[model samples]
Structure formats: structure tokens, C-alpha cells
Target chain A: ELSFGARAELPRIHPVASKLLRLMQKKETNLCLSADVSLARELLQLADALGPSICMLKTHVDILNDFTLDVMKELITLAKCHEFLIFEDRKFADIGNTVKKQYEGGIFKIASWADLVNAHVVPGSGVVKGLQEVGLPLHRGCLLIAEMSSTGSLATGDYTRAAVRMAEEHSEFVVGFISGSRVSMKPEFLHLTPGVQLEAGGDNLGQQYNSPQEVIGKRGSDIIIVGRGIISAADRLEAAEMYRKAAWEAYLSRLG
Target chain B: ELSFGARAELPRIHPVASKLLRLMQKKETNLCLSADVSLARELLQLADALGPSICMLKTHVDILNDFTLDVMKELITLAKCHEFLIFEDRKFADIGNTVKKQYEGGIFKIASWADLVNAHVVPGSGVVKGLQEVGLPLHRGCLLIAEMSSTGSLATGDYTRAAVRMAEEHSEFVVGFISGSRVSMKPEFLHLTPGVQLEAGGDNLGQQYNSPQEVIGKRGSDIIIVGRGIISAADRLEAAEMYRKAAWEAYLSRLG
Candidate 1:
């Protein structure tokens, strides 16, 4: 019976879930390193190694063919042992009824486990009520296909604005806003900018490049999500450390 | 070395995966079912109970507090044992570099497992190339969100057209052109419609309402995705049977 805003105001999660969240929130640098794994088997090893450095570990569960009950037991055990929170990047946009089925039924009964979930408010109250009924924390995020850092992108125009507006009133946790050098961040809502890269130059593809420093300094993001900059690095641990350092430095500089 | 189009042409997925797809396609009659499990432990029993009827099992890996290799082994074993395809609804829309990290990194290693993935093609060839680099099966399909079925939805008009155009040119296998009505089903694309509801009444929260006959007869949906219509029913098996019967009757009528 807790409202989202109320939940955020609550003291903390349950003992076991709280321990995991504490470990995961180590990098208060507001930098969230996206630990996107290529194999389900590697998740535990990576979590064990990087538990203290990440704000939260993002996952796309559909790819986990090897997922099991024992895995859940071990994962929960490790999470409690390490203290990192689990962020399920579900991006749920279905109706409340269907959303309920999705949460409870099937291979990944997410309602029972996820500390937080990513959802699109496209279905309006249906999505909200569904998550509420299921008793899971929901982060109302927008999957903005807005202004690409690349040339000649159409996502920035009127459509993105409308989508942002829709996201504003509906979202509780954060919104993924597409802001370039030209556009400023919306002051009202917490923003999660997805097109971040650590390298200086742009990739062979047209994703505009920015250092973690550039994004936090220039954009003023609350959470910095680096997908490839850290995980794809030759040495993941080293890459993560570099990102963690950059994120913290950026956070401190912003405060100063 | 294969072009996205070429990859689509080649048969790459396991026969079991394809068979599961067919079953889902058949269950498309009244309302198809999909379940989201956040924890690996719960997924085993859930999948076991719902596998025979569920078209796809959606998941959120980060929610699993305890993720490990042995757990993954068991989960995959259940998926294979149950004869259902795993759809990783990640909805990746970033640049190629980030997308690559997301697929191959240390969190939810999608490249190693997911039978199908949801991706947005906004970032262009880079996203496609990134997915290909991971050696993911091309024929597994990309469930493109061409157009959402919600009222006041912005993914209509030109945006929908552009999404459809890109999906047509870039998709290797199935392009998930979603909509609630049959009017959205184009001949060139494989439609994976989601806004299905058997009851005339709308959900207390989401935007969806339709009968099995309406979806198949009027909308021309190739695959129907019903999340709540079955699982939320008082009797899960009876609801599933209704969907299966509806689908069979519709298909038969179509043939006649």
C-alpha cells in the first residue's frame, strides 16, 4: 500500500535486499555501470568482482537460457553477501492485467524478486496499478529515441517533446532524456542519458562520443550508465575502476 | 559476414526454438501468454507449469539476486524441456558500441542465450552490426516496436512508417510490427500483435480490449501476444485452452 514517492522516502528495504543495495550503491558517484554480460554463466563471477563499484547492475534477462532456481538461490546468496541491488531493465509497457500475468507467470517470476523494475507508462494507470498489485518497486522511465548524437536524427523534434511530457507526469524514479550540446536538461525530472561512451572519438557508427566526465559535467545526469566503456573493455575490472573513478570525480566536481 | 537480409534468409535457430515459435503462433487464437520471472528459483516452477501454453517467457535478469552458471544451466534445461522460446525483451536502442557491450558484457549476456530479442533500430547499422558481431542467430528475429497500440500514442503517423521502413530493410527474420488492430498488419512484415484482450471491458490501468476473433479475423495478426487474458484468469489451463481453440478456429477460417 506504499506509493512510489513514499517508498523512496522509506527507511530502507528488507534486511537481505538492503544488504545487496548497500554494496551496489558503493559508487555514490552517481555512475551506474551497465554490466551487460554475453553469457548468463558470467553474471555471478562479474557481480562478485564488481559488487562494490557499481550503483546497480542492469540486466536483459531474456538472454539467460541457463537461468534456474539454484541460480536464484546462489544469486540471492551472493547479493546478500555482497550487498548490491538488482535492477531489472524490463521496460514493461503492457496493460495492467497482462502485466500481472507477466510478473507472476512464466520463467522469471520477477514480482517476487526484483528490487526495482523499469517500466514505460504508455498504458497509463494500467501499468502503475499492475506493478502496485504485484508489490514491486517501479521506476517510471522513458525509452526516449530522441536526438542522437549523430547527424540528421529525427528523434529530437516534436515527437520526443511529447514523449518527454508523457514521461514527466507518469514517471516516478527517472526518465531517459535525449539531450545534446544544443538541448538543455529538463529541470523537473531525474534524467538517465543512455548514449554515453568513454572514448573521445565517435564509434564507426554515428553514436556521438563523450567521456564520463563530459556527460556528468555537461549534461548533469544523476546516474551515468556506461554499457561498453566498462564491460567490453579488454579487462572489465580495470575498465570498471576507470569508470568508477571518472564518475566519482565528476560527482565531486559538480558538488564543488 | 552475412548481411542482415541475408542472415534472415539463412536458417540458423534450433528446430526446438522454431517449434516453440509455431506453438506460440497457434496459441495466438484468443490470447497468447507471456510471463516475466525476475528470480531464477521461481522461474523453474513457473516455467514448468506454464511452458506448455505460454508463447514466450519474458525475463528481467538483474532482478535475480543470485545469478550463477549452474543456475543458468538448469534454467536452459527447463526451457528446452518445456519447448518454449525465450524472448529477451531488452529493447536495446543505443549506439553500436554500447549495444555491443550490452550484448557481450558481464551482466545479462544476451548473445549466449536469448532465442529472440527486442531492439529499436534508431541508431542504424551500428546496432545491427553489434548484434551480428555477437554471433546471435539471425533467424531468431528482432521484435521491432514499429507502432504501439495505446491511445494518445506518439509512435503513430510518420514515426510508425519510418520504423516499418527500417524494419523491412534491416531485419534478418521477423519484424515485430505491433498494433492492436488488424489494419496495422502489413503484408511484408511478420506481425507480433500484443494489445489483445478477450473481454470487452478495458483493464483498470492499461489500454487493451479485443476478442480472439477480432484479432485474427480483422487485424491479420501473425502472432498474438496475450499477457493477462490467460494467466490472470481464475483457471489458467481453461484460459489457455480458450486461446488455443480461438487460434485454431481462426487459422482454419483463414485457410477456408
Candidate 2:
């Protein structure tokens, strides 16, 4: 097991996630683009544009107005072509039986396509167990929601510690945490922080932003999930490149 | 707000939900059948057989193998004929942007058809805010995951109370709670309890079943959600009627 933090050098991910580990070592990049756009066409275009710059594309698959199995299949093809992973940002919160249904049965059939999916520990350890049952057999991974980058979030205080503890217990299934200003966890769980921006700003929806330097440079977030700051840019290509280069540079600076 | 726990309360809901409230009052039934089977045909069969017995048909919509818009449209027709509400048990937990997408987009288009839906308070106030943004216009009711019927769950202690507070603050959008064991909510927040069975026993899964006598009889749950115990029986109709009668009797007994 690699303690990604316990050592000065960036340790490798376990063999279970060989692609992600290899991508990190090869690219010195752990940037995740939150494909927050509502259409399948725009989403794929961005992924195609920034494919080589990042290791993964995080998506809210439920939002696509024109979503189809073919759309998901295309994403699979692109990830293979560009050496990135497909992460379905489904914050599953339910009992074992129900969560299993949502993961494997929907028309989207998340377990069949997603390399990584997210869930909440609010329903307790069973959420992880249920997700693992569907994900492990299919070579998929689960990320637990820890401290979110929002106002008045309940995913804090004692709740965050419990989430990290559950992730620690299920290391094979649990890969990381979606965290914020602070993170405390076993070395195994990677930190993927959202609300990253080129400049500080707040959305009308209560989301507060932080620059790559502040998140990666200060908080040691392994991956910075940026959405509007890139996709909403006038020229998405240049915006993604700027974020990609800055995030990669900041991650390297942390090691030294 | 209507305190559903009060005397012979036939409280009025919004026009969109007026039928559901009127039906429950007229029939004195707060029973919701959770159609947890895998095939769309079988789910419809159960709904068709026991349509009038339940006020709502709670669906794990993703589990249907042959799920299509036509399939859901047929359920809508049945709901109209039987005067029952369609509650899609999504149990969504995500940021506002993602929750909004899960609520409305995709081929299924949950926001267009679902009369009511569920979500977790794990994402805090934003989850309710997001659901309401899509729901209020549609006259849909939102249920928050207040507590789980499973063992070793985290929806307890202060977390559970805080969840209730969020629901209370957003009373217009939040209709009630999915609760078990220790419920401390106001009477206005109707309690929907799962883990209900005809005979006493626990599933091989983490679920621990309570007889309608225990759940509605002892726990005072406003609605009893019975799945396998009814659908798996030799005569689905007879089992459904048995559970419905027992649950209704328990409700009347609790008030008397």
C-alpha cells in the first residue's frame, strides 16, 4: 500500500488502480474536470480537448438532456484513446438493496461504465459495502464524500472523521475523499477537492472557490475538480491548459 | 402546514398533490407499496393488482430491466386511475448542480413524471434547495433521509435532528421524512417507514423487518413500505391486502 503522503515522493496507487497510478506518474497531473455542462455534445468536446492534460473526467451523467448508452460508450472510447478514467459523480445515499439497484440497474447502468463513482457515508457502512458489491466485480472504485466546498454543509465535524474511517476500513473499494480546507485520513485515501478556480469567486448557489495554489499547494489535495472556471471560459482549450499546467506545477512543488 | 398526526386530519396539499391527500383522507390509507422487483412488467402487475390499496407506489425506477419512457408513462396512467402518487426513491445526495440534473435530465426525465422523490440531507441545505427548484413548480414533494431502517447507520444522534431542521425550514418543498426507530420530527412531517413485513423476521441482508403491527402499531409510522414480503408471496394480491389492512388498522388504533 502506498502512503501517498507519508513519503516525500508521490507514491504509486495500488495495483487495483494501475491506470490511475500510471497516469499520475506519467503526467504529474491529477486534475479532474467536473463536466458540469448539461449536454452530452459539449461534455465530450471538452473531454476531447483536455484529454491528454488530465487523468480523469468527472461527470454528473444524470444531467445530459440527450444522454444515451451510445453517449456513455463514446466516453469509454475517448478515455481509452486519451489515457483518462471515467468517474460518475453519483452521490448515492441509500440502503444496500436500493443503492445496488441505482448503481447497476438504471438505464445509465453506472456500474457497467464508470471507472469511479461517489457515495455518501450518511447511510453508514452499508453504502460502501453495497457499492463495492457492484463496483469491485466490474473493476470500478468508490469515492466517499467528506468535507464538501459548500455553505452549511453537514459533511463536517464528527461526520468527516466517520467518513474517513469508513473509507479506511474499505480501502480496496474506497479510493479517496472529496474534501475541503482540511483533510485527516489514513495515507491510502487520496484527496480530491472541488471548487477550484483560476481566481476566487462564489457561485449564486453557495459554492466558494479556491485557486489551485491554495488547494494543492496548501491543503495537499491530490486532485482539483474544476468546472465553470474552465468550461465556462470564452476559450475552453486555453482555460483547460492553464489549469492543467498550473495544477501539475503546483503538485510538483509540493513534493520538493 | 398540516399536522397529519392530528384528529382525522384531511389537510389540503397543493393542487398538484391535492389528489394524493384527498385519496388518503377518503380511504384512510397512508400505505405505500415499494415495488422492488426487477422487471417492469412485474412491477406494473403488482401496481395494477394493489393500486387502490396504496396511496403511493414507491419505485426503485432504475431496477426495471425494460425501463422506457413508455413504461413510466403507463405507471403514470395507473397512478391517475388509482389516484395514487408516484414516488421515485432516488435518495440523491450531491451538490446543487448535480442534484438538479439527477432530478430532471437524462432519458428518463424524473422531474416531468414523478409526483414525489427522495434525497439525503448529507449535502445539507443545498440538496433541499436544488430539489425544490425543480419540484415546487411540478407540485412534487421531497422526502429527506432522516434515519435508516438498517443496523449501524449514521443517520442518528445530532445528524438526524439537523436533517429534520433542514426539512422544517423548507416546509413548502419538504413533505416528510424516511425514518425508523427514534423519530423526533414535528407531526407535519409524515413518517414513511420501510422494513415492514407480514410475519416477523430479518432478511439475509442488513434489513430487520417489523410487522405492520410493530411499525404502524408501535412506532406510529404514517406509511408502511412493504416490498419482498408482499411481492414474493404466493398470492401477491392477498399479501398486499393483508399488509394494507393491518397497516390501516394499526393507524386507526394508534389514533384512537
Candidate 3:
């Protein structure tokens, strides 16, 4: 009901969830910046510029055309210097055996570095278990793709509820849900809502966006994931600062 | 419903689907080798050993810890040498905008070389549009994850139906479905079923297998994807031979 520390204190919260909460509380921000760029150089530039303003830096490592070991190293260094966690939005959706190979053995080797990763629960709870076998020992956590903000998405009704149930059964490894709507569940699970912008609207390719107030206050989401709203801004740092303040204020108002 | 060429001649068959069918009819094979190993060297070895017997080679490029451009190049060259199509099996599940970046921009650059790729329709039909934008021009085809062979998988009933409808709306880009059970649809859409083995059973991780007869004959599937059954064999070439014969005979018997 309060800020992150109170939620972090929940008995069922995963260790990685506890770590992320403590970081958010310490930094006084709940913004998760989605760095959806193609070049590793551009990604690191955003990390360096906006690291101080975010609680987490979300990445699609596969999207980087020039991604390498050095890129991951520098990004990790920046996260430590700025006290933010790194989340790789992988959206893994495969059988348990295949997913384990993806999370642990890939060129990305996601479990080794990412503090958090996510998956679609379409393949069932086995996916959560698959990710946990690789991530739990490494102190990493996972988010379930409970609901998407795209038009005509099939992740709704029974599907979303099933995602919640899957996460409930594996709370030790699943720290949250990547949902647009606030999931009515225990506080141990965070909601990292994407499709957030400075204004409300829809894009040509079916992405529907909501402002920070609508997402954090009305929907009661814990974190707002903003990508192009900040990354495409003329002044990236200033844009991140604006989003951080707006999202934090919305969370504060909602708590009251 | 006769042989591949008859299905290939269907009015709605995509160009890529036609190409795949023509190749299968020419090779007289209905086997797809799932190269699920984690090393690039091991993968190349299997490709060379088994390529002559499979009409398609399914890969999880991200699973290879030592993946490099040279690895992909050699695999492509091997595909050409032995006459088989390459499928990446990405299982992409994201909004159209993000998935576009993933397919076209990633370190893998999946659209550039893979003759076939796949996705989960949980995010909606837009995910199809995303890949088509990148792949249609390149003569690449996509398969929707209509169903999975893992126990307790949620891709059943309505979820599977929606995947079919979504694919139906974009048959030019979507060549088929990845389903364990045959989807009741037009023959133009191939059914590439996995979890196939010489015997039937389950794994510790919830993968339930069917024999080549069950998958190809009883289920009326167009392709049988055999992973461990072939890859872990004492003599992989011999295992490939066994699966090819079993699956091809099943297909021929089904035709009668």
C-alpha cells in the first residue's frame, strides 16, 4: 500500500524482488526506462545519461545489432554506479527444456547478467520453472507477460488470470507481471506496465499508450516502462527526469 | 491432402510454403531435424550428418553459447549443399513495433538468412504483420505456435483457434502452424509437430512425445520435428535415417 520498502517487506517477496524494491526506495523513483534501440553505442549512451533517474533499465539485448560482451560489461558497470537494476525483456515463450537453454546457454547468456527477465506463460507454469532453474541460483527474477497493451492482443480474461496463477505458484522466482492493468493480487508481485508515454494515444502499429498518471494512479501499476517517450526526446536526460517526477508523484498520490 | 505438391498447388499457399512443399516432394522426406544442442560445433556436425534426410532444419540460434556470424554462414552453406530449409524457431511474442526491431535489427538478423521463422500469437495478429514487414520481401515464411507438446500448456481450445484465425488472415506470410495436434484447416497450412520420438512417453520437464506414426499419420501432420530422438542417438545419421523412413512412410500411408 505504501512505497517499495513496505512491499519489499512482504514475506513472499523473492530475494531479487526485495533487492529491486530496496533500490527503488533508495533512489526515490519507480521509473523503468525501456532502452529499445538498435545500436549498442546508442543504448549505452542512454544508460549513461539517464541511469541516475531510473530504478531499472529495461533492454531487449537481441535488438542490438552490435551487442557484445563489452556492451554488457559497460551496462552493468553503469547500473552499479547509478544503483539501478537491469531487466532483459526477453518474453521467452517455449517449453521448459528449450527455455532453460535460452536463458542459460545463449550468446546473450541472460541469466548470468540480467537482474530480471520475463516470459509469456502461454506454455504454462513450466516456463516459470524453466527460467527459475537457471535464474534462482544466480539471484535473478522473472516477470510474466500477463497482459499486453497492443490492440487485439489475446492475453486477456482467462489468459491473464492463468498468468497470475502461474506466478502465484512460483512466487519465489516470479517477482512481477508485465501488465497494463493492475493485477488484483498480493503485494509481493510488482506490475511493470509498458506502453506508457507522456500523453495518451495509439500508434499506427497497434500499440496503445497511457500517461504516467493514468498508469500509476488510475491503474495502480508499480512501475511505468517508457521507451520512445524518453529515448526519442530531443533532450534524453531532461525527458527521463520529467517522467521520473511525474510517475513518482502519481505513485505518491495513489498511496494516499 | 495428397502429397506435398498437391498441397503446394493450393490457391492460398504462400510462395515460401510452395517452395517448402516442392523441396519435400523432391527430397521424399517429411522430417525436420530440431538441432537443440547448445554448441555451434555440435550443431554444424549434426547438420552435415543428417541434412540429406531432412527437408528442414530447425534451430535455436540463441541457444548456441559460441554462436558467431561464421557459424550462421557455415550452416547456410551446409543447407544449400545438402538441400534443406533453415528455420530459426524464434517464437517471437511482442507488440508489432518492438517485434519489428527484434526480427530485422537484432544481432541474429533473422530475416536475412532464415527461410522460415515462428512466433506466438498471444500478442495478436500484429506480431504477424511485424515479421511480414521484414520477411515478406525476403521470401521468408512464418509459423504460428498454435499448440505445444508440453504438459499443461495453455495453447488449447480458444487460444489455438485464435492462432488459426490470425494465420488465416495473413496466409501470405503465415505458411503454417506449430502444433502437436493437427489443426482442422486448409491443406495449404502445413502442420510442423514437435515432441516426436521413435517411441511415445513423457519427460521430467513435461514434454509428452508421440511416435512418428502418431504425429504424421494419425495426426495428419506435414512435418515431424525430432530433437533428442535424433541428436542424442549413438549414431545420429542412423537415427535420422530411422525417423525419415518412419515419418515418410506414415505420410505415404496417410495419403492412401
Using Cα atoms, each model's DockQ against the true complex is: 0.17, 0.60, 0.79
Q: Which portions of model 1 miss their true places by more than 4 Å?
A: A1-28, A38-54, A59-86, A98-116, A120-125, A135-167, A170-189, A202-208, A232-241, A248-256, B1-138, B150-152, B182-186, B197-199, B212-256
Whichever of 1 and 3 has more lDDT, that candidate is 3
lDDT of all predictions? 0.55, 0.78, 0.89
Segments of candidate 2 deviating more than 4 angstroms: A1-13, A181-185, B1-18, B181-185
RMSD for each of the candidates: 8.4, 2.8, 1.2
TM-score of 3: 0.98
How would you encode candidate 2's per-residue C-alpha lDDT over B152-176 as one tens digit per residue? 6788888889888888788788877
Model 2 DockQ vs. reference: 0.60
State the weakest 10-residue window (summed lDDT) of model 1 chain A: A1-10
Q: Write the per-residue lDDT of candidate 1 for residues B191-224, one digit (tens) a residue.
A: 5666666677654554656776777666656556
Q: Please, what are the lDDT tens digits per residue for candidate 3 over residues A1-256?
A: 7578888888877888888899888887999999989888899989988998999999999999888878999999999999889999999899888998899887888887899999998887778877888888898899999999998888899989999998888887888999996885688898999999987787777888999999899998999999989988999899999999988999889888
**Which candidate's DockQ is highest?**
3
Residue B213 C-alpha lDDT in model 1: 72
Q: What is the fnat value (0 to 1) for candidate 1?
A: 0.21
Name the TM-score of chain A in model 1.
0.70
